[PDB]
Structure 1
Amino acid sequence: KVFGRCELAAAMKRHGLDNYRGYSLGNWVCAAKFESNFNTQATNRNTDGSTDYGILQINSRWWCNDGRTPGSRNLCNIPCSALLSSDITASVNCAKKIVSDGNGMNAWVAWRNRCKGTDVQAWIRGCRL
């Protein structure tokens, strides 16, 4: 599923991301925009052989099992395929664990490079949440 911007903002808020670990909803929408262009099915191979999955590009090196990332953990206890579903529950739940893990949203390199420090509120401007 490719979400619209306000549609995903609304879904993210419903699933408990607004101000989760202190990150306003616009941060999450901005991260999703630049990680996956709001497409739940996005997948991208990393140089190290891991792959990133879903609307938030969650990495198989640490967070999910895809059966092809040697040496990796599965800290969200889910198949990476679950991260591709039209329902964002697994992505959101796993993202909560990631953002709790110590470096906050800097875990998403696109968030650090494209969202952090910017007017992230613009991403939810005009939305009926």
Structure 2
Amino acid sequence: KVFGRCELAAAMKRHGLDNYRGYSLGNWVCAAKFESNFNTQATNRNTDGSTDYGILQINSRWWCNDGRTPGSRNLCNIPCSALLSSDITASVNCAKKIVSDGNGMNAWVAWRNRCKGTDVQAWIRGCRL
């Protein structure tokens, strides 16, 4: 599913991501924009052989099981395929664990490089929330 911008903001809020660990909704929408362009089915293969999955490009090295990332963990206790669903529940619940791991949203390098320090409120501007 490719979400609309406000549609995704609303879904993220519904699932308790708004201001989670102090990160406003615009941060999360911005991260999703640059990670996946709002496409739940996004996948990308990393140089280390791991894969990133879903709207927030969650990585199989630590967070989910895909059966093909040697030496990896599955800390969200989910198959990576669950992160591709039109229902963002699994991605949100896993993101909550990731952002709580110590480095906040810096875990998403694209958030650090493209969202951090910017006017992230622009991502939810106009949205009925």
Smaller-chain TM-score bracket: over 0.9
Other structure's SS at 1:39 match: coil
1:51 positional shift: 0.1
- Matched-pair identity in %: 100
For structure 1, the 5+ residue unaligned runs are: none
RMSD (Å) for aligned C-alpha atoms:
0.2
Q: What per-residue deviation string (whole Å, max 9, x for no partner) do you get for residues 45-64 of structure 1? A: 00000000000000000000
Segments of 5+ residues of structure 2 without an aligned counterpart are none
Residues 1-59 of structure 1, C-alpha deviations (whole Å, 9 max, x = no match): 00000000000000000000000000000000000000000000000000000000000
1:18 is paired with a residue whose SS is coil
- 1:104 deviates by 0.2
1:83-122 Cα distance to aligned partner (Å, 9 max, x none): 0000000000000000000000000000000000000000
Q: Secondary structure at the match of 2:47?
A: coil
Question: What CA distance in whole angstroms lies between the structure 1 residues aligned with 2:101 and 2:108?
Answer: 12
C-alpha separation between the residues in 1 aligned to 2:17 and 2:31?
12
The alignment of Structure 1 onto Structure 2 pairs a total of residues equal to 129
Say whether 1:53 aligns with 2:53.
yes
Q: Tell me the TM-score normalized by structure 1.
A: 1.00
Q: Residues of 1 paired with 2:101 and 2:45: CA distance? A: 23
2: CA distance between counterparts of 1:101 and 1:109?
A: 15
